Design a binder for this molecule. Structure first.
Ligand code: 9OD
Ligand code: 9OD
Ligand code: 9OD
Ligand code: CL
Ligand code: CL
Ligand code: CL
Ligand code: CL
Ligand code: MG
Lengths: 116, 115
């Protein structure tokens, strides 16, 4: 046995997603605080992070069951009502659909946000 | 009032470790690629994969979800590893995941991916 090089999937996904969508760290910091803008460098970044855990496919379809598994116990009941209101996604393109979803979630549950 | 921000991965690990009596030291060892066939840690590993929909209630791997964790450039290597290591086998869910982790480690020994 030789020590392997270890890769944190979350870290590697954020590095890749930020590079593939031209996202700045300031932008990521804003997103991590729940502050969003309808600009692809933000919204396609969010999309990219969701897709890397199979929370969305490549056609903006969100997998509710995968999402529920990730959420903590204390948010399960609320999450079911919020996703019932906010899914299926709708918008102008893949990334705007994810924008609209995020905004729908914030409207329904203004005290809840997450970072992957 | 700013929203409370939940760290999903941190929550999932916290929940699994509390369910299985798993210590941070155990999780840190696995994160370094050190594996042992001990339920307190192997059941944690199963729990975490299950939370991510990577495995079902019998520790069967969902191949599309597992491959979906990885970037495009790693799909071929990942598929090769899955050819060697799936389907899972073992005496219970925790042992199935232990055998899977060990297979994955042996099959791609230069690298170790962790949620
Ligand atoms: C429907 C639901 O509960 C959560 C989906 C909201 C989108 C959140 C995106 C988060 C991120 O990209 O960090
Ligand atoms: C259970 C788990 O953490 C999944 C690890 C990610 C997929 C396995 C990687 C294969 C490869 O990249 O060598
Ligand atoms: C069997 C396999 O492919 C991966 C084993 C589980 C690794 C999951 C990492 C968990 C953590 O980092 O806490
Ligand atoms: Cl983009
Ligand atoms: Cl959807
Ligand atoms: Cl479209
Ligand atoms: Cl399997
Ligand atoms: Mg994919």
């Amino acid at each position: 046995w030789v020590p392997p090089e270890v890769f944190d999937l979350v870290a590697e996904d954020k590095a890749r997603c930020m590079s593939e969508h031209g996202t700045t760290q300031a932008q990521i910091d804003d997103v991590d605080k729940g502050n969003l803008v309808n600009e692809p460098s933000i919204t396609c970044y969010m999309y990219c992070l969701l897709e890397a855990f199979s929370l969305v496919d490549d056609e903006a379809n969100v997998d509710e069951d995968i999402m529920l598994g990730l959420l903590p116990d204390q948010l399960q009941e609320r999450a079911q009502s919020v996703m019932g209101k906010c899914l299926p996604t709708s918008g102008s393109d893949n990334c705007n659909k994810i924008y609209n979803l995020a905004k729908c979630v914030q409207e329904s549950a203004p005290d809840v946000w997450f970072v992957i």
